[PDB]
Amino acid sequence: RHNPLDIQMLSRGLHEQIFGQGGEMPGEAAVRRSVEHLQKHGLWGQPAVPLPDVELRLPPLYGDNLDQHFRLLAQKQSLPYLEAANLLLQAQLPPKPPAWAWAEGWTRYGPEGEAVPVAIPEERALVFDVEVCLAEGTCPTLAVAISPSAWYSWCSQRLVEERYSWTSQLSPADLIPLEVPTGASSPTQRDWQEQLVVGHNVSFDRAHIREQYLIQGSRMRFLDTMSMHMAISGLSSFQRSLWIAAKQGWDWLDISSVNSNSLAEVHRLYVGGPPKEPRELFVKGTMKDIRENFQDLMQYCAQDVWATHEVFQQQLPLFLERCPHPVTLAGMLEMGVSYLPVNQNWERYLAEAQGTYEELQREMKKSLMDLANDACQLLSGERYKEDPWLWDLEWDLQEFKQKKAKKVKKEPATASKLPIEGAGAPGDPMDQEDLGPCSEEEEFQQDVMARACLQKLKGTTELLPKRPQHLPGHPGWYRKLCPRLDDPAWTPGPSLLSLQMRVTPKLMALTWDGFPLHYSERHGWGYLVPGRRDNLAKLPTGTTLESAGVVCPYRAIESLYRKHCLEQGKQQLMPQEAAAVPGQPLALTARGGPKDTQPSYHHGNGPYNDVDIPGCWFFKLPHKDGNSCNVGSPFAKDFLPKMEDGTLQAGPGGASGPRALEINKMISFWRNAHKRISSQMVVWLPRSALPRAVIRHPDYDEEGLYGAILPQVVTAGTITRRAVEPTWLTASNARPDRVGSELKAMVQAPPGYTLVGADVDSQELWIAAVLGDAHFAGMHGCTAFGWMTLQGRKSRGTDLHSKTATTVGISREHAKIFNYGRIYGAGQPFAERLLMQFNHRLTQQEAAEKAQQMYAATKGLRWYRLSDEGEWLVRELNLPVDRTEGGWISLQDLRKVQRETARKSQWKKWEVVAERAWKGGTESEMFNKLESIATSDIPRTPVEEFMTSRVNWVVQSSAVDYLHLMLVAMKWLFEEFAIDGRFCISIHDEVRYLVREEDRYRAALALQITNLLTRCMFAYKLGLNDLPQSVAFFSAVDIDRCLRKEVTMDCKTPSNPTGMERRYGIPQGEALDIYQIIELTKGSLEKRSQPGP
Amino acid sequence: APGSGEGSEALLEICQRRHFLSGSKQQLSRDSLLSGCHPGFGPLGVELRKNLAAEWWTSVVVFREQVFPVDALHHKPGPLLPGDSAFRSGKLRENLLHGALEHYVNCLDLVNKRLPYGLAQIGVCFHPVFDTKQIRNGVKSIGEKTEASLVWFTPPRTSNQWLDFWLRHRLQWWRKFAMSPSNFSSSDCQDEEGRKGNKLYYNFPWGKELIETLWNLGDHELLHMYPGNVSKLHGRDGRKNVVPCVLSVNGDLDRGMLAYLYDSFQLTENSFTRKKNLHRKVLKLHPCLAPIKVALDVGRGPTLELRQVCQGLFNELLENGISVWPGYLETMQSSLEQLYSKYDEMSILFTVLVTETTLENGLIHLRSRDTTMKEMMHISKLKDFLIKYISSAKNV
Amino acid sequence: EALLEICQRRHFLSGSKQQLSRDSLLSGCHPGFGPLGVELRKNLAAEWWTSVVVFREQVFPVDALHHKPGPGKLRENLLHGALEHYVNCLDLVNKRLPYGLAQIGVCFHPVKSIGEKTEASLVWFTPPRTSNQWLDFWLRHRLQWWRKFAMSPSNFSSSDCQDEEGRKGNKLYYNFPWGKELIETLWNLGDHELLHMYPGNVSKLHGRDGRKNVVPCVLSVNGDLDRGMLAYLYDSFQRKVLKLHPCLAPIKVALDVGRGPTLELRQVCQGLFNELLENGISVWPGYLETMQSSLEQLYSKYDEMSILFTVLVTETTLENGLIHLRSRDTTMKEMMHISKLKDFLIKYISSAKNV
């Protein structure tokens, strides 16, 4: 239809549920105010140079007020589960702890007793819990049940089952084929009529739901008791933490602190403690014994669990709907029932993955080991048994047998293995085993003469030096072989203690950021102030005789930071602007680095005490993001890694440490990621998989694994409710390449299937967008598409973000993120801080200039605003007051004005419950993430009461809403024929769904359209009655058996593993676009569009 | 560039001297060296390449599957259809793999026809260097290189994965024997046909070099070799039938070795921009790497008793399974220090100078090994510590 | 030949019937060397590598060329390559005397027709005086190689030849019923196969008595290996069974599944196989393989595959750990602790280099 434009095309899809050019934009004032602008913000005149096209032809919908039809969609999903939940909620018969029981169910809350579990809950609705051993098996050992009755299982009969003990191999390894056999209680009940929804708190119940979903079909839906909590009674990152310290052991605890326990404290409050848990933790680690203790108590665990379920629940709904939406609720119902494919490959993609981190370390070690070796030695100096020896000697320790008791006074028939030393238990030593042969000697000649004379010579050499019984029982040399130092002791995966070994940095000569010194091993770095102060090595004739005399290691250690000295200074100009142990700067003085002082966010210097000889040193920054102590680590995660890739760092002459820092840099991300990743373990489809020879056509080894892992996506969670899967909802491409420098691909791969999904850009930036514009009168705007302006212009909008940095000519990926940030919570100080660090010397003052400015430009007129934030002027003006929703709906409870609210009270939250609140900001942002923080650069998307939080969360809370529709509509439409498949994703700005191959094109429309709607709908509530083209037809909808954003990619890196998509499995298939996709599907389906393509 | 040239002389000169490269002259110059118009390698030369073949060889032999082209035959007399002469020069194998093939079907009878393995061994093949012509007679000259070819007759499925499997393994082998293995990449530069199999290279002081190779020319040459009615035996899957695939054989090059001594001391730049210039350097071979493990030593009197028992160590040592340099001779030439230097310039791990301190200072395994650990060693434990040394060192 | 037919079995040499003749085999012209031969060969040569090479580290591995430009010739007197490097390596040991420079190079002679003789060579250089002493004895040395603490090598002949243009040294032969054959030929070029080759300022070469500069003598210790196994290939033979000198036997042991039978037992055997391989012992499993192949129709192949032992891993072991094994000489089926089996063999092995 047509092509109309008081702005951006809208055409004829509208006619059905909207109007294309239909928004009642009022005459001169309204149409003009918006226009008067941009003469100031410089946008119009040329905006009239568009690339407008689209031909839209779709009739799938009916309703009056799209949302009216949205609440309907929400209605269907929400209802069947509302009904089965209803009855679980009003249920009358409390708890019945009978004796206890054993495995698979039956019942037993009883007039008397139990049994009859041949098969599962005919219950129609219940709750459940699950335990899993440190037998580490992610598999079960008991599952607790309420409304009807159900039960515990094979943990505790498991304990009399085979295979030998702990830490190697054993049976549960083969318990991986246990999955299919086990189920999750079948996993299901029937899918025939009413399906029990399940209200629980968090994970691994998410594991009861580790098996309830998986077979790819199932109308069970759940919802956290912890999620909702977050949702209703939740607290912010920093506020809660401050709130936590003071709270257990001053305004509005009503703390509602995630987990269960602290929430029950707020909802109900009695029997409020932990029936169980002092146990189960005093060794969420000891088993074999477990059953004993279990039999007696595990019923306890159960029950405690129940109350929670019951206590949060019967009270958790009402207040939830006290913030009343159908959609929010239904959208989260499916979010929880998410899925993730996997194949034979995860473990392998993951195991090849594991092989590399080692190589790497193993390798820097030798490098290291060697470089340190070379170094220390080449410096002929002083006297042996001291000085650089000390260094080389500690790190390298080996061939020791001194101690640790064990066996002794008992042991059986030695195989020439006889540890000496050995002290307390080991010394009820007795006679035996030493003598010589009749037998024979090897060569006839002087050889025997000599050979045999040698042992004589040697043998006696023993009667010679040292003590004689060391000989009895010869050693075998504990361990290693070359130059390496051994802290071991600690098993905790991914560890390399030779770097914590202070000293490594003087070795690995390192200064160069702020240009130089070399460093001190872990604190700060020297400079060149040939004092005339600092140094009075001076003289005269005195110095001659006495300097040499020395007195203390100091004059020798001093002489060293002094040779070290002139050289550091000469050495600095040369590279910057380019010996008997006292030649290599770092090493000498540094001996023992780098000492007292404080991290103290020291842009500064150390007023003596510290401070000796010719050069001054700046106790290297920074540490806020670290938060509390002295730098301590050169490779310290956080700031430091950033600078390794950073502009400044060291290893001056060659490959050396660059290789080193560079190497480690590669693996850091994986270390930590590592554990969490390897951990999900998994379950698999054995034979009762996808039928129809569907299994057949896809192509399939049949010698591979086709199971899948499911991660707890906290329904809600977050105060924004966004998501709660560190590992999986923290997906990333691979900028800092390497193992798990994303296993994303491997993630999905079922044969007969493929996954439709996509990415909406600034799904967040745009929301912020119309919001303001819409309230700056006509929603066209300024920042937001007013200022996002029509612009894309060849490269694209990042070129706009680019505009932000070019005026202020600078990198953009570093500039873009901070606006997002500006968009979020505060501005002013935060820019200076972050910008400063990532930036350099302009110092606080210049930082000021820039921070203030950037903020000035998008929000810098008097009282509160001009530039770009009439919206925030509204987020702020609408939200510094009462409690609210986000113009769309749903309420975010904790509140500055609103925490305060029955007027001005009690010192007014101290007036520093608010000042302690002044302190959280910046720290909180570099903290926000527990895993990695602010992310890696090149992408990096991660973001007490008062604006900041609140304001930041509006956008966020509102992008949650966003997610739910995409979802609600899609779920809806899948039902709506052309059936397809699954998923919840809701990852970042990505939302992937699974589909059979066919109707994979079909879903494409779904998504497409679903967004149009979402988008469409947003404006009507938010702003009013209309919206544009560009957004409408996304970018394109992506289809592939792989999981990476923007298909062709190929993902070399994991630097390892990297034959990748060659190393193979899959390899990239495009996302159709909007125009194309519609061509094949032609007006969607039933079974009608069908033949031709 | 001038610094790069100096590094080369250092790493080459040391090779002429200290005997690693038998021949001297222009036929040796980098370019020529790589072509092969060189006279050869020192004994040292042999010990390393042998260790290598040997060391590399062990890995190859291990898994459930393993065999040989069995022979490796310069050979090849014959006319027309098999190989096609293109240009000019000679008749000495150019495909250790080719032969490996005739042996194929029988290699097939092997393992019960069961298998889908890798049939191979090591031997010398010849390369000619013919930049370009015109001047006089024509097509003269010849270069030589000792290769390792592993063939594999793989199903359509061992396929890309089995090829890719190799990628993996090979790479970990190098790093294993590499002092700074980051100079060992792979590319996938070629073919609009047969598809993948990547080329390998080393990062010399002047860029990359082609080393090993890796193709998947899955079952295309056998059809070439053994015509059929669409004949013969296909080969077993395990109850089905298939025509066996290609196995990419990194060639050899003496070069792999050639890059190692590089890696080791390659490590030029090492101290090119760091510390004071006392850059005497040392070459560095992973222990298993080095041709010689240690230089026995002996000094003072009686001159013999000590030359003796060194005599003594050697055998004991010789016997154990340790390469040695006997230093009785050694007391003669030089003065202590340059011994060190030579040795370090030699890679010989540690050195023990049995002198007055040796019996008469009754005992002592006298010190040497670097990072300057001149710690006294009662001769034995240590001797048998070295036995350990190898073991752990090797392992990784 | 009786052995001839068994000899190929699963080809222990590449070549059909008429392809390989007891003359083409003596010509190496045969279609080529086969499977099991190599192990032996790599095995053989290697033990020689010890023979003279490992024993008294007075000598070293020299690397001589295979081809020659200019007059375009073939590698026939591998004894030559050494010549060129003498000067090259002389510098090695100050200037002392004497020693050699071993190099097992596949030399030549391709009889018209052609073939390749693998061979190995040693080139020691002794002075005139104690030349003869440090000469006749030499025979003695490896006299024992091949004999190497014999089985049937109670039949290794040696003949003396007057003369020739070298100054003599004797040849080597083996007791071939059909027709004896020359195995190695040691010379005594006490004279010049240098001199001209390395003329001019003779004082540049030469060696020493102990204090006096002199030009040493020239020697040859070659006969070619390629077939050196061909011979040893006969002491063996005398139901079908082929016994062999342990340390030599290309492979060392074998095994398959049994009683278990499917799955795990088989997997365990392979792992065991792998463990034995790590330190240094060849072997052969028969898993996945889908048939029992009997036990005496499969054991005759061990004979024919002149193996050495076996280890029938069974289920009467999964709860005890005891396999029933044999040997390929006298069958006295024994029982054994399948584990200590690691340091086992080494005995029968290391000590097999004894008697």
- Pick from B387, B245, B378, B236: which is nearest to B322 by CA? B387
User: Which residues does chain C have within 8 Å of residue B126's beta carbon, measured at their own beta carbons?
Assistant: 66-67
d(Cα A227, Cα A710) in Å, to the nearest integer? 18
A136: DSSP letter: -
Q: Cis check for the bond before C35: say yes or no (omega within 30 of 0).
A: no
Size of interface A-B (CB pairs under 8 A): 121
What phi and psi, each to the nearest 5 degrees, are found at residue C160?
-110, 135
Query: Does B103 contact C66 at a Cβ distance shorter than 8 Å?
Result: no
d(Cα A781, Cα A771) in Å, to the nearest integer? 9
Q: Hey, what are A25's tokens?
A: 């934009």
Of A363, A447, A458, the CB nearest to B181: A363
Query: Does C88 contact B318 at a Cβ distance shorter than 8 Å?
Result: no
A888: DSSP letter: S
Q: Hey, what are A495's tokens?
A: 């560890």
Q: CB–CB of B302/B331 below 8 Å?
A: no
- Domain span at residue C341 reads 250-355
What dihedral do alpha carbons A159, A165, A168, A170 form, nearest 10°?
-40
Q: CB–CB of A6/A1008 below 8 Å?
A: no
3-state DSSP of chain B: CHHHHHHHHHHHHHHHHHHCCCCCCCCCCHHHHHHCCCCCCCHHHHHHHHHHHHHHHHHHHHCCCCECCCCCCCCCCCCCCCCCCCCCCCCCCCCHHHHHHHHHHHHHHHHHCCCCCCEEEEEEEEECCCCCCCCCCCCCCCEEEEEEEECCCCCCCHHHHHHHHHHHHHHHHHHHHCCCCCCCCEECCCCCCCCCCCEECEEECCEEECCCCCCCCCCCCHHHHCCCCCCCCCCECCCCECCCCCCCCCCCCCHHHHHHHHHHHHCCCCCCCCCCCCCCCCCCCCCCCCCCCEEEEECCCCHHHHHCCHHHHHHHHHHHCCCECCHHHHCCCCCHHHHHHHHHCCCCCEEEEECCCCCCCCCCCCCCCCCCCCCCCCHHHHHHHHHHHHHHHHHC
Q: Is the same domain home to B234 and B307?
A: no
Q: CB–CB of B91/B77 below 8 Å?
A: yes
d(Cα A20, Cα A8) in Å, to the nearest integer? 9
Q: How many CA atoms lie within 13 A of A497 on its CB side?
A: 11
The residues near A457 (Cβ < 8 Å, ≥ 6 apart) are: B309, B312, B359
Other beta carbons within 10 Å of C261: 15
- Pick from C262, C247, C319, C327: which is nearest to C292 by CA? C262
What dihedral do alpha carbons B156, B157, B163, B167 form, nearest 10°?
170
Q: Looking at the complex, report in whole angstroms how far the Cα of residue C92 sits from the nearest Cα belonging to chain B.
A: 8
Instruction: List, as one string, the DSSP characters of A743-783.
Output: -HHHH---TTEEEEEEE-TTHHHHHHHHHHHHHSSSTT-ST
The residues near A338 (Cβ < 8 Å, ≥ 6 apart) are: A213, A710, A711, A713, A983, A984, A985, A986
Return residues 40-59 of B near C (CB < 8 Å): 40-43, 45-47, 50
B neighbour chains, 3+ CB pairs within 8 Å: A, C
d(Cα B270, Cα B262) in Å, to the nearest integer? 12
Name the residue with tokens 């003289």. Answer: A539
| End-to-end Cα separation, chain B, in angstroms | 36
Q: CB–CB of B250/B170 below 8 Å?
A: yes
| Gyration radius (Cα) of chain B, Å | 25
**Residue-level length of chain C:** 355
**SS3 label, residue A77:** helix
Closest chain A residue to the Cα of B167, Cα to Cα:
A1059
Number of folded domains that form chain B: 2
C neighbour chains, 3+ CB pairs within 8 Å: B
Resolution in A: 3.2
Q: Hey, what are A155's tokens?
A: 């943990």
Q: Cis check for the bond before C261: say yes or no (omega within 30 of 0).
A: yes
C1 vs B: CB within 8 A? no
Query: Does B271 contact A654 at a Cβ distance shorter than 8 Å?
Result: yes
The residues near A950 (Cβ < 8 Å, ≥ 6 apart) are: A879, A892, A895, A896
**A443-466 CATH:** 1.20.5.3960
Chain B interface disruption, residue of A417, A656, A665, most B CBs within 10 A = A656
- Residues tagged in the binding site annotation of A for Mg(2+): 759-760, 989
User: Which residues does chain A have within 8 Å of residue B4's beta carbon, measured at their own beta carbons?
Assistant: none
**SS3 label, residue A1042:** coil
| End-to-end Cα separation, chain A, in angstroms | 26
Q: How far is CA A91 from CA A96, A148, A267, A382, in A?
A: 14, 10, 18, 85
**Residue-level length of chain B:** 396
Q: How far is CA B360 from CA A145, A630, B301, B363, in A?
A: 84, 56, 9, 8
User: Which residues does chain C have within 8 Å of residue B124's beta carbon, measured at their own beta carbons?
Assistant: 66
What is the H or E stretch that residue C183 is in?
Answer: strand C181-186
- Residues tagged in the binding site annotation of A for DNA: 237, 498, 675, 718, 948-949
The residues near A1083 (Cβ < 8 Å, ≥ 6 apart) are: A57, A58, A59, A1089
Q: Is the same domain home to C74 and C151?
A: yes
Q: CB–CB of A334/A983 below 8 Å?
A: no
Q: Sign of torsion, CA A253 A254 A260 A264?
A: positive
Q: Which residues pair with B150 in a beta bridge?
A: B120
d(Cα C49, Cα C26) in Å, to the nearest integer? 24
Return residues 80-99 of B near C (CB < 8 Å): 92, 99
Q: Hey, what are B224's tokens?
A: 């070439």
- Pick from C249, C281, C246: which is nearest to C353 by CA? C246
Query: Does B379 contact A359 at a Cβ distance shorter than 8 Å?
Result: no
| End-to-end Cα separation, chain C, in angstroms | 31
Query: Does A454 contact B313 at a Cβ distance shorter than 8 Å?
Result: yes
d(Cα A314, Cα A716) in Å, to the nearest integer? 18
**SS3 label, residue C174:** strand
d(Cα B158, Cα B166) in Å, to the nearest integer? 11
Render the burial of A998-1009: b for 16+ CB within 10 Å, e for the rest. ebbbbbbbbbbb
Cα angle: A210, vertex A216, A219; to 5 degrees:
80
Q: Is the same domain home to B261 and B298?
A: no
Q: Which residues pair with A674 in a beta bridge?
A: none
H-type alpha helices, A729-884: 744-747, 763-775, 798-806, 813-824, 829-838, 843-859, 870-878
In a domain, residue B275? The reply is no
3-state class percentages of chain C: helix first, strand second, coil last, to nearest 5: 30, 10, 60
Q: Hey, what are A315's tokens?
A: 């009270």
Cα angle: A167, vertex A168, A173; to 5 degrees:
105
Q: CB–CB of A214/A186 below 8 Å?
A: no
- Pick from A176, A282, A231: which is nearest to A686 by CA? A176
d(Cα A878, Cα A178) in Å, to the nearest integer? 56
User: Which residues does chain C have within 8 Å of residue B129's beta carbon, measured at their own beta carbons?
Assistant: none
Query: Does B267 contact A655 at a Cβ distance shorter than 8 Å?
Result: yes
d(Cα A625, Cα A923) in Å, to the nearest integer? 6
In a domain, residue B210? The reply is yes
Q: How far is CA C182 from CA C105, C156, C341, in A?
A: 19, 10, 41
What is the H or E stretch that residue A378 is in?
Answer: helix A345-378
Of C69, C94, C116, the CB nearest to B75: C116
Q: Hey, what are C72's tokens?
A: 């375009």
In a domain, residue B162? The reply is yes
**SS3 label, residue A566:** helix
**SS3 label, residue A144:** strand
Q: Is the same domain home to B301 and B177?
A: no
User: Which residues does chain A have within 8 Å of residue B196's beta carbon, measured at their own beta carbons?
Assistant: 1062
Domain-terminating residue out of C204, C226, C249: C249
B75 vs C: CB within 8 A? yes
**SS3 label, residue A708:** strand
CATH topology of domain A65-234+260-342: Nucleotidyltransferase; domain 5 (3.30.420)
Q: Hey, what are A903's tokens?
A: 């007027």
Instruction: List, as one string, the DSSP characters of A217-273.
Output: -------BHHHHHHHHS---HHHHHHHHHHHH---------TTSHHHHHHHT-SS-S
User: Which residues does chain C have within 8 Å of residue B144's beta carbon, measured at their own beta carbons?
Assistant: 65-67
Other beta carbons within 10 Å of B1: 7
Query: Does B102 contact C11 at a Cβ distance shorter than 8 Å?
Result: no
d(Cα B156, Cα A360) in Å, to the nearest integer? 34
User: What is the location of CATH 1.20.5.3960 in chain A?
Assistant: 443-466
d(Cα A1034, Cα A1032) in Å, to the nearest integer? 6
Q: Is the same domain home to B97 and B176?
A: yes
Pairing outcome for strands A140-145 and C156-159: unpaired
- Pick from A373, A398, A169, C278: which is nearest to B395 by CA? C278
The residues near B236 (Cβ < 8 Å, ≥ 6 apart) are: B113, B114, B115, B116, B242
Residue A129 annotated to the active site: yes
Render the burial of A54-90: b for 16+ CB within 10 Å, e for the rest. eebeeebeeeeebbebbbebbeebbeebbebbeebbe
Name the residue with tokens 């670290």. Answer: A626
Query: Does B312 contact A654 at a Cβ distance shorter than 8 Å?
Result: no
Q: CB–CB of A977/A1081 below 8 Å?
A: no
Query: Does C33 contact B70 at a Cβ distance shorter than 8 Å?
Result: yes
- Pick from A445, A400, A433, A438: which is nearest to A419 by CA? A400
Q: Is the same domain home to C44 and C70?
A: yes
**SS3 label, residue A128:** strand
The residues near B64 (Cβ < 8 Å, ≥ 6 apart) are: C270, C273, C274, C285
Q: How far is CA A134 from CA A159, A167, C315, in A?
A: 12, 10, 33
Of A355, A451, A475, the CB nearest to B312: A451
Q: Is the same domain home to C265 and C299?
A: yes
User: Which residues does chain B have within 8 Å of residue A380's beta carbon, measured at their own beta carbons?
Assistant: 372
Q: Is the same domain home to C227 and C299?
A: no
In a domain, residue B384? The reply is yes
Provide the residue type at A822 as one letter.
Answer: R
Query: Does B70 contact C286 at a Cβ distance shorter than 8 Å?
Result: no
Other beta carbons within 10 Å of A686: 13
The residues near A606 (Cβ < 8 Å, ≥ 6 apart) are: A524, A597, A617, A619
Q: Is the same domain home to C192 and C275?
A: no
d(Cα A432, Cα A475) in Å, to the nearest integer? 17
A177: DSSP letter: G
In a domain, residue B278? The reply is no
3-state DSSP of A605-664: CCCCCCCCCCCCCECCCCCCCCCCCCCCCCCCCCHHHHHHCCCCCCCCCCCHHHHHHHHH
Q: Looking at the complex, report in whole angstroms how far the Cα of residue C51 sits from the nearest Cα belonging to chain B.
A: 13
Q: Is the same domain home to B317 and B371?
A: yes
Q: Is the same domain home to C203 and C167?
A: yes
d(Cα A854, Cα A849) in Å, to the nearest integer? 9
- Pick from B1, B18, B52: which is nearest to B265 by CA? B18
User: Which residues does chain B have within 8 Å of residue A474's beta carbon, measured at their own beta carbons?
Assistant: 381
Q: CB–CB of B166/B213 below 8 Å?
A: no
Chain B interface disruption, residue of C7, C13, C14, most B CBs within 10 A = C14
- Pick from C19, B178, B35: which is nearest to A659 by CA? B178
**SS3 label, residue A206:** coil
Q: Hey, what are C104's tokens?
A: 């097992």
Q: CB–CB of C78/C222 below 8 Å?
A: yes
Question: Choosing from A67, A129, A205, A1026, which is the catalytic residue?
Answer: A129
What phi and psi, each to the nearest 5 degrees, are found at residue A568?
-55, -50
Q: CB–CB of A991/A985 below 8 Å?
A: yes
Q: CB–CB of A831/A873 below 8 Å?
A: no
Domain-terminating residue out of C249, C272, C293: C249
Pairing outcome for strands C334-337 and C322-325: antiparallel
What CATH number does the domain containing B326 carry?
3.40.50.800
The residues near B180 (Cβ < 8 Å, ≥ 6 apart) are: A367, A655, A659, B263, B266, B267
Query: Does A1064 contact B308 at a Cβ distance shorter than 8 Å?
Result: no
A688: DSSP letter: S
Domain-terminating residue out of C228, C249, C270: C249
Q: CB–CB of A780/A372 below 8 Å?
A: no
User: What is the location of CATH 3.30.420.390 in chain A?
Assistant: 65-234+260-342
A959: DSSP letter: H
Render the burial of A387-426: b for 16+ CB within 10 Å, e for the rest. bbbebbeebbeeeebeeeeeeeeeeeeeeeebbbebeeeb
Q: Is the same domain home to C266 and C134?
A: no
What CATH number does the domain containing B58 carry?
3.30.930.10
